[PDB]
């Protein structure tokens, strides 16, 4: 093991100050991703973001958001152990295979929308949903995860360009429109050679309708891509959209409700008692949502 | 057909354009050749392109890459221009760290001269950047993963205030950011996302590096002014003290384009010897034709 209970396999990501590795959890054999962050090289604002991201990750339990399994904290280095999504970016998928058929777009978008709406009902807004945030797992389910500015402005809501507040759940709404447009068209509704060009198109809010797009779909684009932030619907309302629910007639997309906590699984508890864990430390680690090695093992056992 | 150049390596690939290094056959001079597939461009790209060509024909400054020839076909546009073999300033900076103020100053005088020169022609650059500053073999400035990488940190604040984004005063803001990078080797305004980048730009406050002179910091304050209409012209900023340290005989002044010489007899006679007529030499130069005749004449001048 290189850290806690994980053998680090290969580097799947490199950053100025952070590093993502593939890893094997030794007890369970399960594959995980390990985000290895060097906190010594982080400025004040980045630490604020990192600590915010950690708080948020600990709280999100949703089939389409990558799951957090462990946080290992040292003075210099933070390790985030999380679900690996092996299918890569949706970005890269559309580049490879072109636009999705509306049918396929729909299956991925219901997951995306559910996941984001799940955040909004916890008063978490993402604020910069982009291409790279959308990952696929082995079954092509959505998992929501040169510099920060690469492929960013095309997802920005008009308010950014107007001096207005950029903080409500309605900013995610805008981005979801751009996301929807990318799924079905394989390109961006708002693009330019530079910022000035990009901004004129965004503040204008008009996008090309591709000739093959359905009116249902285009109607649903209209519900995200509204210039006035305060005139944008909640995702809870957009969930009821006709296009969203084609082929889901007994099955309207509805706000996700998370399973009730299972912190007393006799099967997994007893397995860990074997390996030499105390019953009390298990429950405490789970109830207190400790994201220590105990909880990791318990989650990973599932 | 570009039979008058021998194509050597590719220096750069884009989606619908490539840059090749080439040898101009008659003179042996090395050039950059941008080969643009026009059939793959949309309307606004073509506008930008025709604009770029019109701008480049008119610019003649030793710190702006010279245009030597343009070759038009229905499907393809060929821009034969000056090759700057030193790479980008951005690159050099990451390799060497900041420039000492003495060196930054030599570079920045070139940069300011070049941009101010544009401004006297009512050409505004509108997105000056790291990318856009190249170096020749002697380390002289030559003014030349998507289009949004690195762009926002150079955006002037009006971009974010819904205010117009077309003055020479936009370039002034950019020049300030450029100065700051030369002398510090990092950006004055940065962030992990658009929102954060924007808050910084709009507050307009930047970290003063400990090693920076007060002369330099005063120069920065003349560029980095929030209110667009309160920014000096480059012509005024040229008188700045920091700008003129060690140039006391030699105050930086608006560049004066040299008088047109299309009758150089050395070059004319030499070209006659190569088999050009005196007739076409006259027409091409007086006519500013940017054809093969003019490319040779221009190229013989190095």
Could you tell me which of A110, A68, A105 has the C-alpha nearest to residue A90?
A105
- Identify the active-site residue in B127, B215, B264, B283: B127
All residues of chain B having their beta carbon less than 8 Å from the beta carbon of residue A153 are 148, 151-152, 194
Report whether A160 contacts B202 (CB < 8 A): no
Chain A residues with CB under 8 Å of a chain B CB are 45-46, 49, 127-128, 146-154, 156, 160-163, 166-167, 192-199, 203
| Best A147, A150, A158, A162 residue to mutate vs chain B (most B CBs within 10 Å) | A147
Cβ atoms of B232 and B169 within 8 Å: the answer is no
Residue whose token pair is 């708080």: A55
A151–chain B nearest CA distance, Å: 6
Q: At what angle do helices B101-120 and B168-184 cross, to 10 degrees?
A: 170
DSSP at A10: E
Per CB-CB distance under 8 Å, the chain A contacts of B198 are 160, 166
**Per the structure block, which two tokens stand in for B225?**
């002014």
| Interface contact B165-A199, CB threshold 8 A | yes
With 0-12 / 13-18 / 19 or more C-beta atoms within 10 angstroms meaning exposed / middle / buried, residue A130 is: buried
Pairing verdict, β A77-82 and A68-73? antiparallel
Structure tokens, A261: 């906590």
CB pairs under 8 A between A and B: 87
Please answer yes or no on whether B194 and A45 come within 8 Å at the CB atom.
no
Contact A46 B202 (CB under 8 A): no
Find, in chain A, the residue whose alpha carbon is nearest to that of B150. Answer: A149
Most A CBs within 10 Å: which of B191, B194, B202, as the mutation test of the A interface?
B194
Q: Let me know: does A23 contact A6? Beta carbons within 8 Å.
A: yes
Q: Which of A49, A147, A156 sits opposite B150 (nearest CB)?
A: A147
DSSP secondary structure code for residue B140 in this structure: -
Interface of B with A (CB under 8 A): 44-45, 48, 126-127, 145-153, 155, 159-162, 165-166, 191-198, 202
**Whose structure tokens read 């050039």?**
B31
**Any idea which residue has 């298990």 for tokens?**
A282
In chain B, what is the straight-line distance between the N-terminal and C-terminal CA atoms, in Å? 25
* CA atoms of B202 and B196, how far apart (whole Å): 10
Q: Give A-chain residues touching B45 at CB under 8 angstroms.
A: 193
Tell me if A195 and B145 make a contact (CB, 8 A cut-off): no
Q: What is the DSSP string of A29-55?
A: --EEEEEEEEGGG--HHHHHHHHHHHH
Residues of A in contact with B127 (CB under 8 A): 194-196
Of the partner residues A46, A146, A161, the one whose CB lies closest to the CB of residue B160:
A161
CA distance to B286, B293, B296, per residue, from B280 (Å): 10, 7, 12
- B191, B141 contact by CB (below 8 A): no
| CB neighbours of residue A140 within 10 Å | 12
H or E segment at A142? strand A142-144
Contacts of A15 (CB under 8 A, 6+ apart): none
Decide: B57 and B79 in contact? Cβ < 8 Å.
no
Q: Find the closest chain A residue to B128 by CA distance.
A: A194
Which residue is closest to B190 within chain A, CA to CA? Answer: A148
Categorise residue A271: left if φ over 0, alpha if ψ from -120 to 50, beta otherwise: alpha
Do A39 and A76 contact (CB within 8 A), yes or no?
Answer: yes
Are B71 and B77 contacting, i.e. CB atoms less than 8 angstroms apart?
yes
Q: CB distance A163–B161 less than 8 Å?
A: yes
Nearest-Cα distance to chain A for B157, in Å, is: 9
Beta-carbon contacts of residue B47 (< 8 Å; ≥ 6 apart): none
Domains and CATH numbers, chain B: 1-83 (3.30.200.20), 84-260 (1.10.510.10), 261-302 (1.10.8.10)
| CA-based nearest residue to B20, from B4, B6, B1 | B6
Residue A89: closest CA among A179, A207, A190: A179
The string of DSSP letters for B84-115 reads -TT-BHHHHHHHH-S--HHHHHHHHHHHHHHH
Max CA-CA distance within chain B?
A: 63
Active-site residue set of A:
128
Dist CA A186 CA A100 (whole Å): 7
Chain B environment of A194 (Cβ under 8 Å): 126-127, 147, 151
**DSSP letter for each residue of B233-263:** PHHHHTT-HHHHTT-TT-------PPPP---
| CA angle, residues B49, B51, B53, in degrees to nearest 5 | 70
CA separation for the pair B154, B143 (Å, rounded): 16
Contact B148 A146 (CB under 8 A): no
The residues, any chain, with a CB within 8 Å of residue B153's CB and separated by 6 or more, are: A149, B177, B187, B188, B189, B190, B197
Record: contact A203-B44, CB cut-off 8 A:
no
If 0-12 CB within 10 Å is exposed, 13-18 middle and 19+ buried, where does residue A138 land? exposed
Strand order in the sheet with A77-82: A6-14, A18-25, A31-38, A77-82, A68-73
- Name which of A127, A151, A192 is nearest B195 (Cβ-Cβ): A127
> Counting Cβ atoms within 10 Å, is residue B232 exposed (0-12), middle (13-18) or buried (19+)?
middle
Say whether A195 and B159 touch across the interface (CB within 8 A). Answer: yes
**Six token digits for residue A48:** 């604020």
**Minimal Cα–Cα distance from A61 to chain B, Å?**
25
Place of tokens 């280095």: A77
* Lookup: tokens for B210: 């400990």
Q: How far is CA B289 from CA B34, B77, B179, B281, B284, in A?
A: 18, 15, 37, 10, 5
State the residue for tokens 């384009």: B257
∠ CA B21-B24-B25, rounded to 5°: 130
A31-55 core/surface letters (b: 16 or more CB in 10 A; e: else): ebbbbbbebeebeeebeeebeeebe
Indicate the residue of A152, A156, A162 with minimum beta-carbon distance to B162. Answer: A162
Please tell me what resolution, in angstroms, this structure has: 2.5
Residue found by looking up tokens 């751009």 in the block = A178
Q: Cα distance from B171 to chain A (closest Cα, Å)?
A: 13
- The residue of chain B with its CA nearest to that of A147 is B149
Q: Is the dihedral of CA B78, B80, B83, B89 positive or negative?
A: negative
Q: How far is CA A147 from the centre of its chain?
A: 19
The radius of gyration of chain B from alpha carbons, rounded to an integer in Å, stands at: 21
Pairing label, strands B30-37, B17-24: antiparallel
Cα end-to-end distance, chain A, whole Å: 21
Evaluate whether A279 touches A269 at the Cβ level (below 8 Å).
Answer: yes
Residues on chain A touching B192 (C-beta within 8 angstroms): 45-46, 49, 148
Chain B residues with CB under 8 Å of A166 CB are 194-195, 198
Whether residues B192 and A46 touch (CB distance < 8 A) is answered with: yes
For residue B46, the chain A residue with the least C-alpha distance is: A193
β-pair type (B5-13, A142-144): unpaired
- Answer yes or no: are the C-beta atoms of A176 and A129 closer than 8 Å: yes
Give the residue from B183, B210, B154, B11 showing the smallest Cα distance to B96. Answer: B183
Residue B74 CB neighbour total at 10 angstroms: 7
DSSP for A200-265, written as a single string = HHHHH---PPPTT--HHHHHHHHHH--SSGGGSPPHHHHTT-HHHHTT-TT-------PPPP----
Question: From the CA of A229, how many Å to the nearest CA of chain B?
Answer: 15
Range list of H helices, chain B: 43-58, 89-96, 101-120, 168-184, 194-203, 214-223, 234-237, 241-244, 265-274, 278-286, 292-299
Residues in chain A: 302
């Amino acid at each position: 093991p290189h850290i806690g209970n994980y053998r680090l396999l290969k580097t799947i990501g490199k950053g100025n100050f952070a590093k993502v590795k593939l890893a094997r959890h030794i007890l369970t054999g399960k594959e995980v991703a390990v985000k290895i962050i060097d906190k010594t090289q982080l400025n004040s604002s980045s630490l604020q973001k990192l600590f915010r991201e950690v708080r948020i990750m600990k709280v999100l339990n949703h089939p389409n958001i990558v799951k957090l399994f462990e946080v290992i904290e040292t003075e210099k280095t933070l390790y985030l152990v999380m679900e690996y999504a092996s299918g890569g970016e949706v970005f890269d998928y559309l580049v490879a295979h072109g636009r999705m058929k509306e049918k396929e777009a729909r299956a991925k978008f219901r997951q995306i929308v559910s996941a984001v709406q799940y955040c909004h009902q916890k008063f978490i807004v993402h604020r910069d949903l982009k291409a790279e945030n959308l990952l696929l797992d082995a079954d092509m389910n959505i998992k929501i995860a040169l510099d920060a500015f690469c492929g960013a402005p095309p997802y920005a809501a008009p308010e950014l360009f107007q001096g207005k507040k950029y903080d409500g759940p309605e900013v995610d709404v805008w981005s979801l429109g751009v996301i929807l447009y990318t799924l079905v068209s394989g390109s961006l509704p708002f693009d330019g050679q530079n910022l000035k060009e990009l901004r004129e198109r965004v503040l204008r809010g008009k996008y090309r309708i591709p000739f093959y797009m359905s009116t249902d779909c285009e109607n649903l684009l209209k519900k995200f891509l509204i210039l006035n932030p305060s005139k944008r619907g909640t995702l809870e309302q957009i969930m009821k959209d006709r296009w969203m629910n084609v082929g889901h007639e007994d099955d309207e997309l509805k706000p996700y409700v998370e399973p009730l906590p299972d912190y007393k699984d006799p099967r997994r508890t007893e397995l860990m008692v074997s390996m030499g864990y105390t019953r009390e430390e298990i429950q405490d680690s789970l109830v207190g949502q400790r994201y220590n090695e105990v909880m990791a093992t318990y989650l990973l056992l599932g």
